[PDB]
Amino acid sequence: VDDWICEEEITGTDALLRRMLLTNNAKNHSPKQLQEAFSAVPVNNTQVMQIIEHLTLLSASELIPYAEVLTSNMSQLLNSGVPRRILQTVNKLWMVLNTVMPRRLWVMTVNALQPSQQKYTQNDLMIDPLIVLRCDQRVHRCPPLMDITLHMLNGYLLASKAYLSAHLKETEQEVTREELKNALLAAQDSAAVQILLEICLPTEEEK
Amino acid sequence: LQMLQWLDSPGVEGGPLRAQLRMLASQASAGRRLSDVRGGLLRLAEALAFRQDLEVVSSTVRAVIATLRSGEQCSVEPDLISKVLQGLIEVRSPHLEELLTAFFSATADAASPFPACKPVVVVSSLLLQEEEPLAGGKPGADGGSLEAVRLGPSSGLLVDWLEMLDPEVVSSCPDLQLRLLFSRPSFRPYLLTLFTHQSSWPTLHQCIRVLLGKSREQRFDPSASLDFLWACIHVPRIWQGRDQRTPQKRREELVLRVQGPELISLVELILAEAETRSQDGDT
Amino acid sequence: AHVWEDNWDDDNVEDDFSNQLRAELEKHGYKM
Amino acid sequence: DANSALMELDKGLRSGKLGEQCEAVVRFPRLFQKYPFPILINSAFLKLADVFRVGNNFLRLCVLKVTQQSEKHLEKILNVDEFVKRIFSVIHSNDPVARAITLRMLGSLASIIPERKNAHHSIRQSLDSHDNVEVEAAVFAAANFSAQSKDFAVGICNKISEMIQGLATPVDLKLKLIPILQHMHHDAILASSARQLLQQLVTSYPSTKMVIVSLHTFTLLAASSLVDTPKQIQLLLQYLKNDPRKAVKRLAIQDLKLLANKTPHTWSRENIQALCECALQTPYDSLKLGMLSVLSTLSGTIAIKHYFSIVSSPRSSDLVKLAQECCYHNNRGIAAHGVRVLTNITVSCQEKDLLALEQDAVFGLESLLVLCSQDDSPGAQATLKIALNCMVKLAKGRPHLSQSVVETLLTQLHSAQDAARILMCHCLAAIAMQLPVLGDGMLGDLMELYKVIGRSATDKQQELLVSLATVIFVASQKALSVESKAVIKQQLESVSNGWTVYRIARQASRMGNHDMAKELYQSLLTQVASEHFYFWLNSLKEFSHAEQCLTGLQEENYSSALSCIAESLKFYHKGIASLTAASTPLNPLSFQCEFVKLRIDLLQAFSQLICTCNSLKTSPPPAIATTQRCGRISNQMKQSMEEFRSLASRYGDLYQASFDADSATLRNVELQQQSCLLISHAIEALILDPESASFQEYGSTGTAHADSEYERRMMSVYNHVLEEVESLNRKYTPVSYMHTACLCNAIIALLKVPLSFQRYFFQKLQSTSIKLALSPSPRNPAEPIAVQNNQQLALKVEGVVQHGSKPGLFRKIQSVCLNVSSTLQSKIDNMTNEMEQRVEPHNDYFSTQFLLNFAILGTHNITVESSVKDANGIVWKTGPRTTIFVKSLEDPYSQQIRLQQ
């Protein structure tokens, strides 16, 4: 319900007013422009902040083509020195893209937040959702990327519930199988909770 | 005559073949403007202003210096000439629109203050061109213009340009920026609630130690500093999901730890706030 | 933004009766 | 089958599956649209409430969607308290998403619960919470409650002031919370406090984002609280002048646009000076277009008359010269705005030292035209729209320029593409329609242009022939030559669509050229692939034939009058037989049949009248017995009174019963009714009691609007007949032969000016119907409602209005007059309970309470009539005319008491 409820009208169509009065000429920005803006050999955060701040105002359907460059360039957004609007606004753009293209966005975000390589598919993520909690070490202290990871983990847990129900229903050719699936789901959710709570520990390097 | 001139101008705009007819039209417009200046007195540019607008539009030449034009604009600013300043600004903007060159970092601050003092109609585009291909530290010039020059409306744009090009609040120049946020202005609350919700936590801790540090100069305003403290206590990112307004009054949930001299400095700062009493009174 | 206010022939001012009339009448496309 | 859908969808609601419940919930709005009566609405909303109470937080979002969509049905809910309690029972839950959904539901429900205190407490409590979705939903619901409640408005004024300038709650949240200050216009000191807070905010947060949001909020506060709008217009002029940012200037443009559209009388002279002066020294072109668009919208109203007010030479005024250099500007849109401004100055106030601009004005139009003809782009097409509207208005305001106007237009009708021939033909059609003396001055030139269209393109061809032949019909104010008919005919034999010829035929039937209407209706008759369309085209053919027979008249010749009238009646009767055959249950053509029937009755009133005028030459003076009325002719013209007065009443009844036509069709019906009154007055002034006339037409007979040529020729005929009546008043004998000759010439004069089948005869734009579901018990068919004959019958009539499209296009329903009557069906007849009530609908609903007294013994017949009252005040007699049956039983104790007494 969070994804649909972030789509609702907030106060006074202020976003409509902004897309009426600030994006008169935004056709100069392109996905590849953001691509070499990110991939500069120095870290010029000013131009990427320019592009993403202009990218806030676009509709989600118009923001579909930038999913490739944003997701492929999440991994650079973990080094010590990135400004905070870059992380927060990439989080906002990810939340906007989550309202339209959620499954492809999640399966693309798994393959980018992984530590530095295995290319993962939707079937593996629905069979096992704990790869979402197998992200990079620096994600554990980056709040926007952890927020993305948490929405992704909740979505894949519900996904795994539906997938196990469907795989149990198809492969009948019954009470024992149903309770075994219930036990698997219960232990799965408990394991996810325990891994999250162990993320909540202070690490030994800072202690 | 106005309809014929407008028809000729659309042909010159569409007909970009070698601009020989454009040169002939420019010469004809210059001759007509000279004749109108010589003879036209009572009919004050009823249609001659259309010729003036066409001549101004056709005069979009490209400057070939792009470094000494700043000095010419600065000299024109002391002379107080309107059309000369407009022509110089239009020439400087097209030169910056060309390939990037090496701009001086000393006369840019004086040139910006000159176009901000007098009402310049092309200030925003010129500032955008100068700060886009900038061969120097633009944040220092913006901070100096914001702190020193008391431009009424346009400083707001400067404030925007600050957050438009400085990624954090504190990035490279801490001293001028700290004296900008805290002093002995009107744009201070916006940049301060930014710095509350913009900077990274180590930078915020650096500011919180240098703010309530031992300093007898009293270089920070107490109201802004204390409200910055009180905001940093209750940032919504810290308490983002905790159950609200059912607490235990005996229990204390969380605080912010500071040191002994930090406590002494904070209490003498809050009593220095309390000892102002210009018109407030005891209550 | 319309020039002629009493125009009988705008982009879509055709009622239902005229809609089936146009549907069965444009198909033939010949007149003697 | 009204509640059966409710049981079906609520059977869907009692599933254990989320999908079926969601399907039923989202299927509810269609069921809401199909039956809008509040019994079903209340029941389905209570079912939505107790589905909302227990749910898995995704059903809740669906019910929120349904409540958001079906907002106009919210006032029909009866059991409001149970509904709101069932919704409100979720605020005390601990799921923040569920709480946010429930506050959004409260914000949607705001209209029906403005002053519920616990709702306000919940909004205030959740408003300063820490979960972001709860905060955003709280801001939404605070915005929706703040538009209606006042105590909520002041408390939330204090709260939102604190949370905006509390220096926590980051800038995105401040941007979200400034519209709370937008909705805050309820009280004077509340508005003043909000105004001070907004001024402090806009001088305190000088950003691009906050300044835009705060300025839009501040101008919505100004346009809501009309106490200091000039102060905000002033502040907008300093923000548009002294601010280097560009987006702030663009909001200043759209802001001044909204304020000039809303309250233009508050615009002072120095405000217009400031706007014009800021429009001069701007270096940009989009900003120039924006300011002069604002000035163009300001030029269409009474702001110019305040601007050009006595107590400087207006040539030296800023607005007119700014209009000149922006009329002679390179860009097309700024030229269109400037020529609008110049045209609006010309059409407005008539001071002498502005007249020279008239010349400039007209040249400007053609200059702009030759810029925007040869471009073929939608921006250039819009520039064509704006320019041609200015051409029409300029020719309308100052007629002495108009002739020059039209000839210039014909020049650009020689050389332009197929998309520019149209809308220029439309401008010529409008100008030659109301002002006809110029139309003939085209004539033949259009011929050769029409010849060029013999070898033009194909894509835009059909509409272009339609436009050209329409302006041909409009320009031919007198008649069409035979060669003109031949060239038009041979061109559309060369190429035509088949629907194009139908449009040309109906244009000719509109204007009055019924011979080409005959020929094209023949062409349609051979064509076409359905039953009732064939019968419709045959009827139109017969009407065109009778109208050509009516055009074949000669003045001062009564023999040809009788002959051509008989031919017209027989062709109309073949046509009305075809119309009756063409009538369908799906499209019950009622205006056409009644209009044709009353036209037939008018021509037969004319035929009986002309042969009655012939009767004085066909009978004696009276008889040998008579030697102050003598003869059968007096009784015959008294019958003429009865027939013509009844016919005028029937024309009035056709006028009142339509309500869906345009101005032109109604005015044509008024022309026919005025013809009936004209002949009635003419006869009752000449022969039947000259003595008590004594009027001699003491009203105005000139200075008419003359919206059509047919109107003008009708009015000329009316004035000539009244002149003949005044002259021949009380000089001659009561029977006379100058009297009969006066009637003969009057009938000839009425039948010379042909006819005009108007828009409502062919196409219907607005469709409005009323339901009136009677519920005493609604009965079934022949089964009557039983009453006990000692109590009245609570009728409880309830209704709803159905709009076809564009709700109200021409007229708007203000109030509706329900009338009820009874009739003793056993065989005055129970006129004792004729009752009348006025209804003002809330959105679409009609709810009244009717008590009917059935007293005597018998079966009674309740009839219910509707009557729409419009905004101006004219009553319109539409409605379903609903009838219901009641039987009157008696109490056996009362029967025994009456037998004993």
Coordinates of C-alpha atoms in Angstrom, one line a residue, chain D residues 190-603:
Chain D
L190 CA -7.5 35.2 10.1
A191 CA -6.8 36.4 6.5
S192 CA -4.7 39.3 7.8
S193 CA -2.6 37.0 10.0
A194 CA -2.1 34.6 7.1
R195 CA -1.1 37.5 4.9
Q196 CA 1.5 38.7 7.4
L197 CA 2.8 35.1 7.7
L198 CA 3.1 34.8 3.9
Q199 CA 4.9 38.1 3.5
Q200 CA 7.3 37.0 6.3
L201 CA 7.8 33.7 4.5
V202 CA 8.4 35.2 1.1
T203 CA 11.0 37.6 2.5
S204 CA 12.5 34.9 4.8
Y205 CA 13.0 32.0 2.4
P206 CA 14.2 33.7 -0.8
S207 CA 14.5 30.6 -2.9
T208 CA 13.2 29.5 -6.3
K209 CA 11.0 26.8 -4.9
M210 CA 9.4 28.5 -1.8
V211 CA 8.9 31.8 -3.5
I212 CA 6.8 30.1 -6.3
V213 CA 4.8 28.1 -3.8
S214 CA 4.2 31.0 -1.4
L215 CA 3.2 33.4 -4.2
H216 CA 0.6 31.0 -5.6
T217 CA -0.7 30.5 -2.1
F218 CA -0.7 34.3 -1.5
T219 CA -2.6 35.0 -4.7
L220 CA -5.2 32.3 -4.0
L221 CA -5.7 33.9 -0.6
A222 CA -6.1 37.3 -2.4
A223 CA -8.5 35.9 -5.0
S224 CA -10.5 34.2 -2.2
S225 CA -10.5 37.2 0.2
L226 CA -11.5 40.2 -2.0
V227 CA -10.5 42.9 0.5
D228 CA -6.9 43.7 -0.7
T229 CA -6.5 42.2 -4.2
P230 CA -5.0 45.6 -5.5
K231 CA -2.3 45.2 -2.9
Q232 CA -1.3 41.8 -4.3
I233 CA -1.5 43.1 -7.9
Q234 CA 0.9 45.9 -6.8
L235 CA 3.2 43.3 -5.1
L236 CA 3.1 41.2 -8.2
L237 CA 4.2 44.2 -10.3
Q238 CA 7.3 44.7 -8.1
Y239 CA 8.0 40.9 -8.3
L240 CA 7.6 40.9 -12.0
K241 CA 9.8 44.1 -12.4
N242 CA 12.4 43.8 -9.7
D243 CA 13.4 40.2 -9.6
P244 CA 16.2 38.6 -11.7
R245 CA 14.8 35.1 -11.7
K246 CA 12.8 33.8 -14.6
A247 CA 10.4 31.2 -13.1
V248 CA 9.2 33.8 -10.6
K249 CA 8.4 36.1 -13.5
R250 CA 6.5 33.2 -15.2
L251 CA 4.4 32.7 -12.0
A252 CA 3.8 36.5 -12.0
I253 CA 2.5 36.2 -15.5
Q254 CA 0.1 33.3 -14.7
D255 CA -0.8 35.0 -11.5
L256 CA -1.8 38.3 -13.1
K257 CA -3.6 36.2 -15.8
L258 CA -5.7 34.5 -13.0
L259 CA -6.3 37.8 -11.2
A260 CA -7.3 39.6 -14.5
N261 CA -9.7 36.8 -15.3
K262 CA -11.2 36.9 -11.8
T263 CA -11.5 40.5 -10.7
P264 CA -10.6 42.9 -13.5
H265 CA -12.5 45.9 -12.1
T266 CA -10.0 46.3 -9.3
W267 CA -7.1 46.9 -11.8
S268 CA -6.1 50.5 -11.3
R269 CA -4.6 52.9 -13.9
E270 CA -1.1 52.9 -12.5
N271 CA -1.2 49.1 -12.3
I272 CA -1.8 48.9 -16.1
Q273 CA 1.0 51.5 -16.5
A274 CA 3.3 49.4 -14.4
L275 CA 2.4 46.2 -16.4
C276 CA 2.9 48.0 -19.8
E277 CA 6.2 49.6 -18.7
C278 CA 7.5 46.2 -17.4
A279 CA 6.4 44.8 -20.8
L280 CA 8.5 47.3 -22.7
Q281 CA 12.0 46.9 -21.2
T282 CA 12.1 43.1 -21.1
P283 CA 14.9 41.5 -23.2
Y284 CA 13.1 38.1 -23.5
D285 CA 10.3 37.0 -25.8
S286 CA 8.4 34.4 -23.9
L287 CA 8.1 36.9 -21.0
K288 CA 6.9 39.5 -23.6
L289 CA 4.3 37.0 -24.8
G290 CA 3.1 36.3 -21.3
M291 CA 2.7 40.0 -20.2
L292 CA 0.9 40.9 -23.4
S293 CA -1.3 37.8 -23.0
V294 CA -2.3 39.2 -19.6
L295 CA -2.9 42.6 -21.2
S296 CA -4.9 40.9 -24.0
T297 CA -7.2 39.2 -21.4
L298 CA -7.4 42.5 -19.6
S299 CA -8.4 44.3 -22.8
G300 CA -11.6 42.2 -23.3
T301 CA -13.3 43.6 -20.2
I302 CA -14.2 47.0 -18.6
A303 CA -10.6 47.5 -17.4
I304 CA -9.9 49.5 -20.6
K305 CA -12.9 51.8 -19.9
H306 CA -11.4 52.5 -16.5
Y307 CA -8.0 53.0 -18.1
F308 CA -9.3 55.4 -20.7
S309 CA -11.3 57.5 -18.3
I310 CA -11.6 61.3 -18.3
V311 CA -9.7 62.9 -15.3
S312 CA -3.0 63.4 -21.1
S313 CA -3.3 62.5 -24.8
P314 CA -4.2 58.8 -25.2
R315 CA -1.8 58.6 -28.2
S316 CA 1.0 59.2 -25.6
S317 CA -0.4 56.4 -23.3
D318 CA 1.8 53.4 -22.8
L319 CA -0.7 50.7 -23.7
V320 CA -1.4 51.9 -27.3
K321 CA 2.2 52.2 -28.3
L322 CA 3.1 48.9 -26.6
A323 CA 0.3 47.4 -28.6
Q324 CA 1.8 48.9 -31.8
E325 CA 5.3 47.6 -31.4
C326 CA 4.0 44.2 -30.4
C327 CA 1.6 44.1 -33.3
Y328 CA 4.5 44.8 -35.6
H329 CA 6.7 42.1 -33.9
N330 CA 8.4 39.2 -35.6
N331 CA 6.9 36.4 -33.5
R332 CA 3.4 35.2 -34.4
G333 CA 1.9 34.8 -31.0
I334 CA 3.0 38.2 -29.7
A335 CA 1.6 39.7 -32.9
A336 CA -1.7 37.9 -32.3
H337 CA -1.9 39.2 -28.7
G338 CA -1.0 42.8 -29.9
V339 CA -3.6 42.8 -32.6
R340 CA -6.2 41.5 -30.0
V341 CA -5.2 44.5 -27.8
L342 CA -5.5 47.0 -30.7
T343 CA -8.8 45.5 -31.9
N344 CA -10.2 45.7 -28.3
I345 CA -9.1 49.3 -28.0
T346 CA -10.9 50.0 -31.3
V347 CA -14.2 48.2 -30.4
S348 CA -14.2 49.8 -26.9
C349 CA -14.7 53.5 -25.9
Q350 CA -15.2 56.0 -28.7
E351 CA -13.0 59.0 -27.9
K352 CA -12.1 61.0 -31.0
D353 CA -8.3 61.0 -30.7
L354 CA -8.1 57.3 -31.0
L355 CA -9.7 56.9 -34.5
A356 CA -6.4 56.9 -36.4
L357 CA -5.5 53.6 -34.6
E358 CA -8.5 52.2 -36.5
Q359 CA -6.5 52.4 -39.7
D360 CA -3.5 50.8 -38.0
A361 CA -5.8 48.1 -36.6
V362 CA -7.1 46.9 -40.0
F363 CA -3.7 46.9 -41.7
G364 CA -2.3 45.0 -38.7
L365 CA -4.8 42.2 -39.3
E366 CA -4.0 41.6 -43.0
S367 CA -0.3 41.9 -42.2
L368 CA -0.6 39.2 -39.6
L369 CA -2.8 37.2 -41.9
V370 CA -0.2 37.1 -44.7
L371 CA 2.3 35.9 -42.1
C372 CA 0.1 33.1 -40.8
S373 CA -1.5 31.8 -44.0
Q374 CA 1.4 30.0 -45.6
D375 CA 2.7 28.1 -42.6
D376 CA 0.5 25.0 -41.9
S377 CA 1.4 24.4 -38.2
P378 CA -0.9 24.2 -35.2
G379 CA 0.6 27.4 -33.7
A380 CA -0.1 29.2 -36.9
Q381 CA -3.5 27.6 -36.9
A382 CA -4.2 29.1 -33.5
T383 CA -2.8 32.4 -34.8
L384 CA -5.4 32.1 -37.6
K385 CA -8.1 31.5 -34.9
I386 CA -7.1 34.6 -32.9
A387 CA -6.7 36.8 -36.0
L388 CA -10.1 35.9 -37.5
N389 CA -11.8 36.3 -34.1
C390 CA -10.3 39.8 -34.0
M391 CA -11.4 40.4 -37.6
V392 CA -15.0 39.5 -36.7
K393 CA -15.0 41.7 -33.6
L394 CA -13.3 44.6 -35.4
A395 CA -15.9 44.5 -38.2
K396 CA -18.7 44.1 -35.6
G397 CA -17.7 47.1 -33.4
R398 CA -17.0 49.6 -36.2
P399 CA -19.1 48.9 -39.3
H400 CA -17.6 51.7 -41.4
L401 CA -14.3 49.9 -41.4
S402 CA -16.1 46.6 -42.1
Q403 CA -16.2 46.9 -45.9
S404 CA -12.4 47.4 -46.1
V405 CA -12.2 44.4 -43.7
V406 CA -14.0 42.1 -46.0
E407 CA -12.2 43.0 -49.2
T408 CA -8.8 42.4 -47.6
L409 CA -10.0 39.0 -46.5
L410 CA -10.9 38.1 -50.1
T411 CA -7.4 38.9 -51.2
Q412 CA -6.0 36.2 -48.8
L413 CA -8.7 33.9 -50.0
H414 CA -6.9 33.8 -53.4
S415 CA -3.5 32.4 -52.3
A416 CA -3.5 30.1 -49.2
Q417 CA -3.5 26.4 -48.5
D418 CA -6.4 24.1 -47.9
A419 CA -6.3 24.6 -44.1
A420 CA -6.5 28.4 -44.5
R421 CA -9.5 28.4 -46.9
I422 CA -11.5 27.0 -43.9
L423 CA -12.0 29.4 -41.0
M424 CA -11.6 32.3 -43.4
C425 CA -14.7 31.1 -45.1
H426 CA -16.1 30.9 -41.6
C427 CA -15.2 34.5 -40.8
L428 CA -16.8 35.6 -44.1
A429 CA -19.8 33.5 -43.2
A430 CA -20.3 35.3 -39.8
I431 CA -19.7 38.8 -41.2
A432 CA -21.9 38.3 -44.2
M433 CA -24.5 36.7 -42.0
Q434 CA -25.2 39.5 -39.6
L435 CA -24.2 42.3 -41.9
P436 CA -25.5 41.4 -45.3
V437 CA -24.9 44.4 -47.6
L438 CA -21.3 43.3 -48.2
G439 CA -22.0 39.7 -49.1
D440 CA -23.1 40.2 -52.7
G441 CA -19.9 42.2 -53.1
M442 CA -18.1 38.9 -53.2
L443 CA -20.5 36.9 -55.4
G444 CA -18.8 35.8 -58.6
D445 CA -15.2 36.0 -57.2
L446 CA -16.0 33.0 -55.0
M447 CA -17.1 31.3 -58.2
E448 CA -13.6 31.3 -59.6
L449 CA -12.1 30.4 -56.3
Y450 CA -14.6 27.5 -56.2
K451 CA -13.4 26.6 -59.7
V452 CA -9.8 26.3 -58.4
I453 CA -11.0 23.7 -55.9
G454 CA -11.9 21.5 -58.9
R455 CA -8.1 20.7 -58.9
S456 CA -7.1 21.0 -55.3
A457 CA -5.9 18.3 -52.8
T458 CA -8.1 15.6 -51.2
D459 CA -7.3 15.4 -47.5
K460 CA -9.0 18.7 -46.4
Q461 CA -11.1 18.9 -49.5
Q462 CA -14.6 18.0 -48.2
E463 CA -14.7 20.4 -45.3
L464 CA -13.4 23.1 -47.7
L465 CA -16.2 22.6 -50.1
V466 CA -18.6 22.7 -47.2
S467 CA -17.2 26.0 -46.0
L468 CA -17.2 27.6 -49.5
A469 CA -20.8 26.6 -50.3
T470 CA -21.9 27.7 -46.9
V471 CA -20.5 31.2 -47.4
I472 CA -22.0 31.1 -50.9
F473 CA -25.4 30.5 -49.4
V474 CA -24.8 33.2 -46.8
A475 CA -23.6 35.7 -49.3
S476 CA -26.6 35.1 -51.7
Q477 CA -29.0 37.3 -49.7
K478 CA -31.5 37.7 -52.5
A479 CA -31.3 34.5 -54.6
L480 CA -29.0 32.3 -56.6
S481 CA -28.7 32.4 -60.4
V482 CA -29.3 29.4 -62.6
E483 CA -25.7 29.4 -63.7
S484 CA -24.5 29.5 -60.1
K485 CA -26.6 26.4 -59.4
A486 CA -25.1 24.8 -62.5
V487 CA -21.5 25.4 -61.5
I488 CA -22.0 24.3 -57.9
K489 CA -23.8 21.2 -59.1
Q490 CA -21.3 20.2 -61.8
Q491 CA -18.4 20.7 -59.3
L492 CA -19.9 18.4 -56.7
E493 CA -20.8 15.9 -59.4
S494 CA -17.1 16.0 -60.3
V495 CA -16.1 14.9 -56.8
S496 CA -18.1 14.5 -53.5
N497 CA -18.1 12.4 -50.4
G498 CA -21.9 11.9 -50.0
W499 CA -21.9 13.4 -46.6
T500 CA -20.5 16.6 -48.0
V501 CA -23.6 16.9 -50.2
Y502 CA -25.8 16.3 -47.2
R503 CA -24.1 19.2 -45.3
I504 CA -24.5 21.4 -48.4
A505 CA -28.2 20.5 -48.7
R506 CA -28.9 21.2 -45.1
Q507 CA -27.0 24.5 -45.3
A508 CA -29.2 25.5 -48.3
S509 CA -32.3 24.5 -46.3
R510 CA -31.0 26.7 -43.5
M511 CA -30.4 29.8 -45.6
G512 CA -33.5 29.5 -47.8
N513 CA -32.2 28.2 -51.2
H514 CA -34.6 25.3 -51.4
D515 CA -34.2 24.4 -55.1
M516 CA -30.6 23.2 -54.6
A517 CA -31.9 21.6 -51.5
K518 CA -34.4 19.7 -53.7
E519 CA -31.7 18.6 -56.1
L520 CA -29.3 17.4 -53.4
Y521 CA -32.1 15.7 -51.5
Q522 CA -32.9 13.8 -54.7
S523 CA -29.3 12.8 -54.8
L524 CA -29.5 11.6 -51.2
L525 CA -32.7 9.8 -51.9
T526 CA -31.2 7.5 -54.5
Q527 CA -28.3 6.9 -52.0
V528 CA -28.3 5.6 -48.4
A529 CA -28.6 2.2 -46.7
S530 CA -31.3 2.3 -44.0
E531 CA -35.0 2.6 -43.5
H532 CA -35.6 5.7 -41.4
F533 CA -32.7 7.7 -42.9
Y534 CA -34.3 7.1 -46.3
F535 CA -37.7 8.3 -45.0
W536 CA -36.0 11.3 -43.3
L537 CA -34.3 12.3 -46.5
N538 CA -37.6 11.9 -48.5
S539 CA -39.3 14.1 -45.9
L540 CA -36.7 16.8 -46.3
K541 CA -37.0 16.5 -50.1
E542 CA -40.8 17.1 -49.9
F543 CA -40.3 20.1 -47.6
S544 CA -37.8 21.6 -50.1
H545 CA -40.4 21.0 -52.9
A546 CA -43.2 22.8 -51.0
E547 CA -40.9 25.6 -50.2
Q548 CA -39.9 26.1 -53.8
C549 CA -43.7 26.2 -54.5
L550 CA -43.9 28.9 -51.9
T551 CA -41.1 30.8 -53.5
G552 CA -43.1 30.8 -56.8
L553 CA -45.4 33.7 -55.8
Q554 CA -46.4 36.9 -57.4
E555 CA -47.6 40.1 -55.6
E556 CA -51.2 41.2 -56.1
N557 CA -52.3 37.9 -57.6
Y558 CA -54.6 35.8 -55.4
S559 CA -55.1 33.0 -58.0
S560 CA -51.4 32.1 -57.9
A561 CA -51.6 32.4 -54.1
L562 CA -54.3 29.7 -53.8
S563 CA -52.6 27.5 -56.4
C564 CA -49.1 27.6 -54.9
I565 CA -50.5 27.3 -51.4
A566 CA -52.3 24.1 -52.4
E567 CA -49.1 22.7 -54.0
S568 CA -47.2 23.6 -50.8
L569 CA -49.7 21.8 -48.6
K570 CA -49.7 18.6 -50.7
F571 CA -45.9 18.5 -50.7
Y572 CA -45.8 19.1 -46.9
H573 CA -48.3 16.3 -46.4
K574 CA -46.2 13.9 -48.3
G575 CA -43.3 15.1 -46.2
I576 CA -45.1 14.8 -42.9
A577 CA -46.2 11.2 -43.9
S578 CA -42.5 10.5 -44.5
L579 CA -41.5 12.1 -41.2
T580 CA -44.1 10.0 -39.3
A581 CA -42.7 6.9 -41.0
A582 CA -39.2 8.0 -40.1
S583 CA -39.9 8.2 -36.4
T584 CA -38.0 5.7 -34.3
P585 CA -38.3 4.6 -30.6
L586 CA -34.5 5.2 -30.2
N587 CA -34.6 8.6 -31.7
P588 CA -38.2 10.0 -31.3
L589 CA -38.1 12.9 -33.6
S590 CA -40.5 15.3 -31.9
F591 CA -39.3 18.8 -32.7
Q592 CA -39.3 18.1 -36.4
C593 CA -42.8 16.6 -36.5
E594 CA -44.3 19.4 -34.4
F595 CA -42.5 22.1 -36.4
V596 CA -43.7 20.7 -39.7
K597 CA -47.2 20.1 -38.4
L598 CA -47.5 23.7 -37.2
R599 CA -46.1 25.0 -40.5
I600 CA -48.8 23.0 -42.3
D601 CA -51.4 24.5 -39.9
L602 CA -50.0 28.0 -40.5
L603 CA -50.3 27.6 -44.3

